[PDB]
Every structure is written in C-alpha cells, then in structure tokens.
C-alpha cells in the first residue's frame, strides 16, 4: 500500500504489481527515494483527471530515471479511482507523472500495440480517499506559462509512506 | 521559404538554416517528404501560440522521425511570429511538431542548458500571413480527450510549398 500525505489529507493506493510489474517497480522506488514529496498536483481537469508527481511547488522541474515500458496491454482499464501512468506521445516515455481517474476514461484504454492503441497504463487503485480526490479536482486552476489547468493554490504531496 | 497552405489561407516562412541547422535540416525534410500535408493545429491557444504538425484531421497520430536536439542555444527568441520547435520535458526531445508564437513568450526563452533553462528552439519566422495567423488563434476550442485546446472546425495545412 502506499499513502500520499497531501495538504488536503491522505490518498491511500494498492498497486498491482503482478499486472504491471515494471511499472509498480518504477513507482514504488520513485516512492521510496522521497522523490515524490514536496511535488504537486500541476493538472487538474474537473470531470476527466488529477496529474501530479512531476514539479515541485513554483513548477520546478524535477529530473527523473530513464523511461519505462508501457504495461497497458495488461487489460486493465481506466475506470474512476485508478492511476495511470502520465507519458508523452510515445508509448514507451512514462517517467515519474502519474494521474487519477477521476471518471471512466475508456478512450484511455489499451486498445492494441499500436502508436493510436497502446494507450495508458493502469498500475494502481485509490482504496481510501477519494473524498480526497474529489476535493482536489474541484479546485481553481489557470494558465501558468506553457502549462494548462494549473491550480492557482498548490495541492502539495507533502510525504509518502509505502505500507 | 516555405508556405503553409492552409484551409485559412497562405503563410510564408523563412528559415535560419545557419542558426538551427540540425532544427531546419529536420523540419525541411517533413516539409519535402509531405508529412505536414493533411495535418491540422490541434493546439490552439489565444494570446499564446498556436501549435501543429504532429495528428491528421480526427486526431489520427502520425509516427515520425528520431528526435532532434535542442539548438535553443542559439539566442534566438520566442517573439511574435517566430516558429519554435515543441518538445516534451525533455530537452532533447522535438520530432515533428512546431508552435507559432503570436505574442512575445519570453518566459520559454532558454536561458541556461539545464532542464529548467533549455526553453523553446526557435527556427524560423513568419514574412507573409501573420493575418492568417491571427485569424487561427481566435477560433473557439475544447477538450478532445486527453486534448486541450482543440479546435472545434479543423485548421488544416493543406500542403506545403517549399520555396
């Protein structure tokens, strides 16, 4: 299990590693090394997701390890209250982003190893605390450079406990 | 130079082949080879740029070439009319699309080659259209999946005149 201690309350995850086990693995190191905390929830879009684990308050960049493979032919689907592994147009290039369903999002899903297909990896279940995630994909966001539905105050993962 | 037919209208660009090399011998190849024909400004931001090059009308991903490195170094700025590379976080990281600027965006400016200086590689500039840009910017948009600022009618690049 894993708690993301944020400054609006805590957001408890079971992950799937027998699913997506390089994933998980990826995660969980991520998690352990402390590189989550004192990251925020930069993209909030009310009714589709919540994305964090890549900034830190003031959207500092932070580096991350080498990409992974994505997993999500393991046929789990995007359904309200799992996380996905963010990635950019490439289906091998998730990093350390990650977002919550916040809804079914099916057109996220896995639909053949192909460049249009491949979709998003599900690797994760929020099992308490969607109250949590439901406060926070409420929240005013805006423009803050080249970056869209930003929160105008920052929603912080202040630490993470794994188990 | 090169024109951009588009279904608004003619843009005409000129090219820093001796200040972006590796950034323009990349670009002009898409534009020779017919890549950007069909292809639409999926990202449509008012008082901010407008982006293309990288789906098909319907949103239909195109697979490119390998990625190219950021030659923002350069000194080249992001000011009103200038064509920049998109890229994901990485620096290193810009395939096939490109953004206009249609207002001054200082702030993706490099400053420094770290990840959080590298900023935008700008390659070009527009000599003719910028009217034609300015209509495009002020079309109504919407979400489209994981897609922000989409516009509702296709902005379609028709085909593309090199010189």
Request: with cysteine; aromatic share 10%.
């Amino acid at each position: 299990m894993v708690t993301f201690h944020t400054n609006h309350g805590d957001i408890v995850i079971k992950t799937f590693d027998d699913k997506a086990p390089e994933t998980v693995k990826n995660f969980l190191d991520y998690c352990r090394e402390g590189f989550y905390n004192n990251t925020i929830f930069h993209r909030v879009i009310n009714g589709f997701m919540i994305q964090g684990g890549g900034f830190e308050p003031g959207m500092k960049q932070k580096a991350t390890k080498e990409p992974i493979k994505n997993e999500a032919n393991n046929g789990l689907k995007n359904t309200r209250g799992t996380l996905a592994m963010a990635r950019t147009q490439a289906p091998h290039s998730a990093t350390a982003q990650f977002f919550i369903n916040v809804v079914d999002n099916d057109f996220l899903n896995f639909s053949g190893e192909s460049l249009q297909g491949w979709g998003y990896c599900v690797f994760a279940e929020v099992v308490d605390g969607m109250d949590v995630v439901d406060k926070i994909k409420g929240v005013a966001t805006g423009r803050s450079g080249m970056h869209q539905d930003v929160p105008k105050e920052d929603v912080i993962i202040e630490s993470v406990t794994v188990s």
